[PDB]
Write a protein that binds this DNA or RNA. Structure first.
Ligand SMILES: *[C@@H]1O[C@H](CO)[C@@H](O[C@@H]2O[C@H](CO)[C@@H](O)[C@H](O)[C@H]2NC(C)=O)[C@H](O)[C@H]1NC(C)=O
Ligand SMILES: *[C@@H]1O[C@H](CO)[C@@H](O[C@@H]2O[C@H](CO)[C@@H](O)[C@H](O)[C@H]2NC(C)=O)[C@H](O)[C@H]1NC(C)=O
Ligand SMILES: *[C@@H]1O[C@H](CO)[C@@H](O)[C@H](O)[C@H]1NC(C)=O
Ligand SMILES: *[C@@H]1O[C@H](CO)[C@@H](O)[C@H](O)[C@H]1NC(C)=O
Ligand SMILES: *[C@@H]1O[C@H](CO)[C@@H](O)[C@H](O)[C@H]1NC(C)=O
Ligand SMILES: *[C@@H]1O[C@H](CO)[C@@H](O)[C@H](O)[C@H]1NC(C)=O
Ligand SMILES: *[C@@H]1O[C@H](CO)[C@@H](O)[C@H](O)[C@H]1NC(C)=O
Ligand SMILES: *[C@@H]1O[C@H](CO)[C@@H](O)[C@H](O)[C@H]1NC(C)=O
Ligand SMILES: *[C@@H]1O[C@H](CO)[C@@H](O)[C@H](O)[C@H]1NC(C)=O
Ligand SMILES: *[C@@H]1O[C@H](CO)[C@@H](O)[C@H](O)[C@H]1NC(C)=O
Ligand SMILES: *[C@@H]1O[C@H](CO)[C@@H](O)[C@H](O)[C@H]1NC(C)=O
Ligand SMILES: *[C@@H]1O[C@H](CO)[C@@H](O)[C@H](O)[C@H]1NC(C)=O
Ligand SMILES: *[C@@H]1O[C@H](CO)[C@@H](O)[C@H](O)[C@H]1NC(C)=O
Ligand SMILES: *[C@@H]1O[C@H](CO)[C@@H](O)[C@H](O)[C@H]1NC(C)=O
Ligand SMILES: *[C@@H]1O[C@H](CO)[C@@H](O)[C@H](O)[C@H]1NC(C)=O
Ligand code: NA
Lengths: 749, 747
DNA sequence: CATGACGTTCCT
DNA sequence: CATGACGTTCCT
């Protein structure tokens, strides 16, 4: 049975996904298709420039419709091609069940007629420059109206968006209104008092008064940021904001008793008026980033009594010309008893001392502290010892150099109690004194420093709780046998991208320390170019995962018998990545020397042109084998051996032309098979002994299928269509003639 | 007309190249083949296990025959498969013109009968474990005999190679003998006195006496290294050599009056007996590397008076356990008046001072000094000011951190004075380090840890510096006078300084480029430049800019800010825009590249469309590299008229068709790469049936449809321009022809 | 026959 | 029916 909505794909929850199919018109599906079951129709980024009364009328129960990016205005078109989208009068009225409509990134200049069922309407990046009471007539259920970006540098219009006074008052249920990037100079008058979210950023609203927020006492979030910009900080085209601005009335916000979030970023503020925050008893999030508040934060009383604030962003409040020698936060920060997160990155100050953050030092709920990108060159990390709630400190991208004068292979630190990021700093050695008061730390990131030390067990002595240590992207000289032995709780160690020492031709290195790390579970030695003069064996009874990608096992395993048991003493290993090791050849003997406990083996992006399948019996616990990106020319030379517990096999991006009958048939636990990006001209059920119904994933995309009438693959792919990703569109013909590059369904074979 | 020696390829100077064709037997070429043109036949790395009397018998002018790697011994086989090569009695006698034979990496246990014309014979990595007077009968013209590696860890045999006393004396013209890796314990007796090169390294010859070199007074090179090894330094399996060894006689070499080169590397030497080198009046090259000579070199008189010596290698004479605080070379080094090159890398000493190298400092001819990998942490670079001859110092891979308490980027090989300080521990650059190095023309500082905001103060003394390599550092580029203190600067490598450009929210500034009035070559490659940078690069001097590995994608999406970024490079002729994540181009932004451009690389982007007509905006463009993009056709108009384009690379795209006449108006086109696309045909119509001016047309790695097709006749017509035509141009279809050469069958 | 096309965007 | 095969090796 054909996919029911060709050329589109039926996805869960009644979604017909027609995205990125280069359609010039809305598909008309068969009277035989289950049109009644379609609840969402996605037409993202097709080339539909004309919508008709008939387009959606046969989808009797359509609730959600996405027409984004079909006819982009010239400014947003990659080639600046103009586009005007025409819409027949009843296009959307013909869908009286429609609840959500996305019409963004289309060249339309007026709002079409819309059914009164509508709950959510997105008209952003269109060319609609006016809203009046007739524009959205009858939409009494509308909760969300987003119309951002109809007049700005990427979509210019030569004037302001004009929203007539009271234009939206008929929208009695409207809770969310966003009108960003519309070249506004004033807040539209008499907006719906139902509003909870009003987003007016990146216009030119440079004066704000309580009258501009009349009757909006239901507001939970107000964003007026980016209206009076500091263009020194801009990454994009930026209009200068004259120095008399902004002009905020002291009582602008005082009636917004329900306000939870206020965004005043990128407003050229040199002053905080405490009166702005005084009526705001429910305020939990305040964004003051990208202002000129560097001196203000040393003295302000504006945080006095804001004992409910949870998140405060003061990032990029930097002085144009300078960094500060010292920075001392105002006493009023000590009032912020609910504060959980403080972002102070990008301010630029040279010293972090006890005085710097003293008012924060007893805040009981302060969990996250962002101090990155501050050009700090002296930091007393001991200041943090007694912060009672700290989970996470980001001190990355600083110039600290010492004491004061995927997850299957490497876990993240997100679930840990206390994490310090000192990555992208200027350490060349590690001295334990810098860590003396950080014994509570569970995770420490030191990646991308300049550490060139021969570590030896003396560096990390204070770090008695440390579980995870990231030393990636340094120059550690590994040879001392007691490296990292001073870390009693170390479970994960990342030594990836420490290749320089290993590249020193003729100088030996030593990985015997690995055996002396009794709790180590995850290790990376990836991208180190390890290739000669190293330990003959890695040993560990604890290790579960080893990333050895990006080395030269090719060289090592060509060196007589020296390295043939390199991984064998990893007696508990379950995951091993040998990708990108320049392997042109393996031995069965060498595969039988990997740990018997192995469950997952990656050999991606090597140069293997032959693989001895029968050797898989030497890894009885193997579940996943990844051979993607090698040079296999066939799946032959026997077939997958019996008794295999293999569940997942990836042979994508090889050069496979042929698979022998039965190749996969004895791998009774096989569930996921990737054959994508090979040279297969057919897909044969005989490869599976005609028992392919247990597969959950069978990816045959990017193969030169021969689209002749009655090829095996047609019927077969239909039989296992639930397993084949992208079947309707991404499974293409290589031949014959004009079918090359087309879907196998472009024609009925 | 078919290629004349299918399945092989005819190459220049009468070479028939049959390499890597998986052949199981020597080809018998067509009846009409021009066999008298075959002066060399290469059969490297096929799977020919049986050679026959008739194999080479019709090749009447054959001079050179390469059969290497056809039947490797088990130890050398990638899978340890055994192989024995059989050779019929007259296989080579049938070629009385044969001068050079390579039989290495084949499982043979005896030497075949060979023609008396033979000049060179390579029998290495075979299983021949004896040579007797009957092994090489009648080869009176033989000058070279290489038989290395017939008994060692990769090809074991369980005994020594046995060369009978006087076995080779009938080789009256023999000048080169190599018998390395053969498990020898003594030098074979009574070797030919004609010998000039005798190579005996990596055996177990641990005693050497003048009698072991009897009558070999024509020797120019003797290599006995690696016979008594230090296994601590070994990268491979290594047999420890008992401490009583080696045993050399004081006069072992004294009769070798013509000796030019002597190799005593990896011999476990703790002593140098000056008598070894006295009387070697012609000695120019001495290799003493990988011994234990670290104390010996501070005191030895062994170099006293060795006035002819030009090259001395003392590398990796390190102490097992330690580095030395100081190292002082012996006074005798001051007598090496001919010395041109001294290799002292890998000895391990912490300080380089005036005293360290004092004996070298007046040697008039000393040009190259190798001091890398020494763990040096203090270096007074001013010591070098007054060395009269110095061209090149390698101080890479050390721990120096400051003063003591090609068409895109030229190399420094032609300059007067180059210092390599790459892979050191600089975090800033202080001018004082360089105060006495004003003469330098090239300075390499790659792979240090330099994190400074350069500002025009760093390099003040370097008033002759032409080339400066700062790749692989963390330089913060924003000061407007960076590098302006270098008045001769012509080439600057700032590649791989990505960390600062990766600081999201923090701006950088490239305006200093405009202030470098002699700059010709600049690399900003692999910097991840993507936002908050100068809107324009400006230079009237620059010829070449490598901007590969950035994010012009992001920059050119940012309204109009960066649309003129390269336009002010008013003399630019080469630009690399590869790997910039480009999914699209504007025609107007290609027309904002300098009109002077000759070469534009756009490799490894994600371009699925290209507006060919935009090429008229670059009137001087000769080379366009679009390899590794996502083009699905060559269409959308042709190459425009008037183009000077000579070279076009569209390899590794997804091209499935080319419109008729696509290439026809590109009258200067000479080189076209279509490799690794999805083309099922090759059509002369693409060229308007005028493809004869092409010098290179690469159509390899395309799924050609091998039906009884345009391409067949066409490729034979332009065969001189098609690389690898006999073997690497393959069928995608139909049926069993998939993956075979288009010549595997007659289409 | 006042319209196509480009292309995984968009963010600031 | 005492043999094939693997592969761009080899270096120390
Ligand atoms: C099968 O393999 C292909 C290609 O090897 C996968 O496609 C890639 O997917 C990864 C992440 O999963 C991306 O990083 C690549 O950029 C994709 N490239 C292409 C060309 O598609 C594909 O996802 C795999 N299939 C499944 C079901 O996992
Ligand atoms: C045509 O293009 C192909 C592929 O893009 C070239 O093949 C590559 O050549 C370079 C060396 O120049 C190697 O680094 C790659 O590994 C090669 N890959 C393959 C698959 O061959 C080919 O050399 C080009 N042809 C000519 C005549 O220059
Ligand atoms: C809001 O919408 C609901 C339907 O979702 C409707 O029943 C209710 O009457 C509407 N209220 C107003 C004020 O329009
Ligand atoms: C914004 O409006 C002003 C004044 O009407 C106009 O000059 C300017 O062109 C407009 N900006 C844009 C991007 O269209
Ligand atoms: C605010 O609402 C009151 C009645 O609730 C009305 O009198 C007044 O006009 C409203 N203000 C605006 C600006 O719409
Ligand atoms: C929060 O807003 C409510 C209305 O939702 C108001 O009654 C209350 O006073 C506010 N809370 C505080 C602490 O002011
Ligand atoms: C480790 O090295 C440091 C300095 O490099 C040194 O002080 C300490 O003694 C060393 N520790 C050991 C165990 O050798
Ligand atoms: C590696 O270091 C260990 C010290 O734990 C030592 O026993 C061993 O000999 C060294 N091995 C190599 C190959 O350097
Ligand atoms: C593996 O199979 C291929 C054909 O699919 C064949 O050419 C080759 O000889 C086989 N190799 C082995 C070792 O059996
Ligand atoms: C050496 O070879 C030459 C030709 O290259 C030959 O004429 C001469 O007789 C040979 N000499 C000896 C001593 O065999
Ligand atoms: C070298 O010869 C010895 C003694 O005859 C023998 O024991 C050894 O196995 C040989 N070595 C090799 C690599 O065959
Ligand atoms: C060295 O040459 C002389 C004759 O020139 C000969 O008598 C003697 O046997 C030779 N020595 C050896 C070891 O062959
Ligand atoms: C450059 O920076 C150094 C410190 O690295 C400073 O001493 C010097 O004065 C600065 N030079 C200029 C020209 O600003
Ligand atoms: C770069 O510096 C120059 C002055 O040297 C200044 O004109 C320009 O604004 C700066 N550009 C950026 C992007 O910072
Ligand atoms: C480019 O050519 C392709 C045919 O290969 C065509 O589909 C596409 O519409 C053309 N684009 C333009 C801009 O002409
Ligand atoms: Na253990």
């Amino acid at each position: 049975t054909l996919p029911p909505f060709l050329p589109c794909e039926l996805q869960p929850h009644g979604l017909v996904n027609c995205n990125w199919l280069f359609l010039k018109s809305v598909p008309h599906f068969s009277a035989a298709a289950p049109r009644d079951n379609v609840t969402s129709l996605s037409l993202l980024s097709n080339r539909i420039h004309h919508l008709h009364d008939s387009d959606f009328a046969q989808l009797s129960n359509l609730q959600k419709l996405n027409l984004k990016w079909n006819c982009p205005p010239a400014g947003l078109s990659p080639m600046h091609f103009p586009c005007h989208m025409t819409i027949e009068p009843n296009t959307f009225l013909a869908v009286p069940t429609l609840e959500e409509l996305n019409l963004s990134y289309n060249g339309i200049t007026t709002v079409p007629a819309l059914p009164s069922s509508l709950v959510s309407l997105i008209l952003s990046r269109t060319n609609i420059l006016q809203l009046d009471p007739t524009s959205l007539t009858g939409l009494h259920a509308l909760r969300f109206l987003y119309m951002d970006g109809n007049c700005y540098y990427k979509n210019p219009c030569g004037r302001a968006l004009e929203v007539a006074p009271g234009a939206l008052l008929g929208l009695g249920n409207l809770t969310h209104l966003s009108l960003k990037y519309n070249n506004l100079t004033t807040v539209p008058r008499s907006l719906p008092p139902s509003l909870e979210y009003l987003l007016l950023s990146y216009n030119h609203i440079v004066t704000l008064a309580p009258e501009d927020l009349a009757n909006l006492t239901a507001l939970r979030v107000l964003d007026v940021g980016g209206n009076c910009r500091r263009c020194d900080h801009a990454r994009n085209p930026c209009v200068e904001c004259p120095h008399k601005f902004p002009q905020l009335h002291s009582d602008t916000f005082s009636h917004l008793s329900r306000l939870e979030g206020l965004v005043l970023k990128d407003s050229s503020l040199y002053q905080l008026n405490p009166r702005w925050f005084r009526g705001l008893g429910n305020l939990t999030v305040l964004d003051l980033s990208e202002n000129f508040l560097y001196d203000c934060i040393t003295k302000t009383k504006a945080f006095q009594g804001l004992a409910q604030l949870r998140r405060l962003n003061l990032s990029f409040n930097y002085h144009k010309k300078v960094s500060f020698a010292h920075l001392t936060l105002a006493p009023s920060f000590g009032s912020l008893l609910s504060l959980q997160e403080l972002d102070m990155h990008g301010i630029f100050f040279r010293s972090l001392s006890q005085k710097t953050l003293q008012p924060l030092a007893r805040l009981p709920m302060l969990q996250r502290l962002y101090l990155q990108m501050n050009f700090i060159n002296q930091a007393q990390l001991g200041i943090f010892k007694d912060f009672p709630g700290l989970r996470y400190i980001d001190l990355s991208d600083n110039r600290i150099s010492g004491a004061v004068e995927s997850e299957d292979f490497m876990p993240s630190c997100k679930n840990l109690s206390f994490t310090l990021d000192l990555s992208r700093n200027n350490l060349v050695t590690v001295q334990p004194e810098m860590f003396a008061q950080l014994s509570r730390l569970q995770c420490l990131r030191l990646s991308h420093n300049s550490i060139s030390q021969a570590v030896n067990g003396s560096q990390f002595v204070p770090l008695t709780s440390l579980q995870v240590l990231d030393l990636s992207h340094n120059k550690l000289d590994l040879y001392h046998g007691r490296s990292f032995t001073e870390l009693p709780r170390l479970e994960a160690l990342d030594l990836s991208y420490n290749s320089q020492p290993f590249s020193m031709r003729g100088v030996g290195h030593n990985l015997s320390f690995v055996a002396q790390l009794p709790t180590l579970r995850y290790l990376s030695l990836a991208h180190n170019g390890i290739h000669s003069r190293v330990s003959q064996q890695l040993c560990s009874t604890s290790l579960w995962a080893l990333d050895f990608s990006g080395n030269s096992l090719s060289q090592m395993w060509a060196e007589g018998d020296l390295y043939l048991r390199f991984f064998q003493g990893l007696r508990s290993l379950i995951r091993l990545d040998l990708s990108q090791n320049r392997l042109h050849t393996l031995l069965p003997c060498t595969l039988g020397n990997l740990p018997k406990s192995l469950q997952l083996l990656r050999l991606r992006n090597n140069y293997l042109a032959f693989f001895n399948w029968s050797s898989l019996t030497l890894l009885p616990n193997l579940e996943t084998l990844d051979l993607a990106g090698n040079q296999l020319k066939a799946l032959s030379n026997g077939s997958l051996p019996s008794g295999t517990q293999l569940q997942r096999l990836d042979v994508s991006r090889n050069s496979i032309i042929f698979v022998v009958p039965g190749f996969f048939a004895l791998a009774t636990r096989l569930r996921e098979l990737n054959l994508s990006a090979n040279a297969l001209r057919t897909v044969e059920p005989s490869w599976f002994g005609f028992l392919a119904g247990s597969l959950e994933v069978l990816d045959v995309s990017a193969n030169p299928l021969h689209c002749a009438c009655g090829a095996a693959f047609v019927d077969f792919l239909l039989q296992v269509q639930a397993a084949v990703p992208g079947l309707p569109s991404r499974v293409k013909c290589g031949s014959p003639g004009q079918l090359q590059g087309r879907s196998i369904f472009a024609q009925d074979l």
